[PDB]
Write the structure tokens for this entry.
Amino acid sequence: MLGLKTSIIGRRVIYFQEITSTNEFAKTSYLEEGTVIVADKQTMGHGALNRKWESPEGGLWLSIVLSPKVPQKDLPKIVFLGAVGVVETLKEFSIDGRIKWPNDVLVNYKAIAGVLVEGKGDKIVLGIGLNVNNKVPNGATSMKLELGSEVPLLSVFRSLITNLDRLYLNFLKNPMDILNLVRDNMILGVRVKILGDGSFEGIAEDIDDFGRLIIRLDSGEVKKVIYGDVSLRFL
Amino acid sequence: MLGLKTSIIGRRVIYFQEITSTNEFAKTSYLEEGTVIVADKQTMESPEGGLWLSIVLSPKVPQKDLPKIVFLGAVGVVETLKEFSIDGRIKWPNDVLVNYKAIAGVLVEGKGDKIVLGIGLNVNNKVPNGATSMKLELGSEVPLLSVFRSLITNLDRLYLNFLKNPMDILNLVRDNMILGVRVKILGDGSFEGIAEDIDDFGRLIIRLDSGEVKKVIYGDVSLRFL
């Protein structure tokens, strides 16, 4: 009854009034490629680095099952499809989102969405959490706060699924393309600090052909940061 | 993202751009009670524009009451049609007509612990000769999702009350069914008479011209209006 016209993502959609985690369900259940798992609220949701995700009613919480037949080295870039898809959807609603490498989307430096990718067998699960009408933590934002009006949640879902399907179909053919979209929609030219062991600071210059963040330290040294188990802060 | 607030029916919803049959998927798959299977179209064809869904139910009521599940679907559809100002009436015991034109059909299949309630309703889809749709009745396209929300809400209320008071559904059927007219019952041969009412078991009571009264149990018979 939803009348989705996408080719792969959205062929099937499993909606839950409540769920522990859309990503966990997607990982442990046999689902055909393109299946979208979406819930009104998550009781045990999280994002990258297992950062607890408050997923109250009003937000868009979903996961997508993908099994891309692309070279092994390209498989990691799936996370960027999510970030770019969110940026494209936000633009349709007149909101300018920018990517905080590698998994977050900010609006005027305020967090509005997060992406996470996990694996189970040969299946890849792309998880996305977008603040729409839900209440958000101080410092964060939502489509509702940015527009000063409630936003039809289903309309956001339709828009995002449409954008993700388009990006995914092209990814299967031209997998290097997504990096260019990320590059043009990410926050660069500013100082950042990579947290954790061997912590360092420098200017986030760009991302390379592997999606690694290229940072120029004040000494002139150039470091390439792999995305995945990385924590970054804007200075 | 749908924000359904129902108690059981609609706790989960599995949507398909296309499927062979929502009833077959529901019967075959491991699904929890209340899960709704809905598709834009069924290939084995229920065309795009219609509301094609199946609901997984596990009612813990006496076996003598289970035959009444089909009525939950028929009444639910009638209530939704009335919400859209369409006069749907029940053709005993599983069809809904508008001025004698088919607009919806209900199909229940079960094996005890799992009963599948299937419903097909013509909304914006093209329909066969003699049938009608919500779009044809209202004169314009009807938001399919709005019909879905309305129906799911009605079915959930009807189902929850049925679990506690299985007899209540019968009065809603009587109040919304086509009666007082001649019908032909086809099965082991056939007979004709006036459809008088439904009894406490949901059986159709027919008065033959001879005065004989027959009680029809659905399962291996078909009803035809004359």
The longest strand of chain A covers residues 110-120.
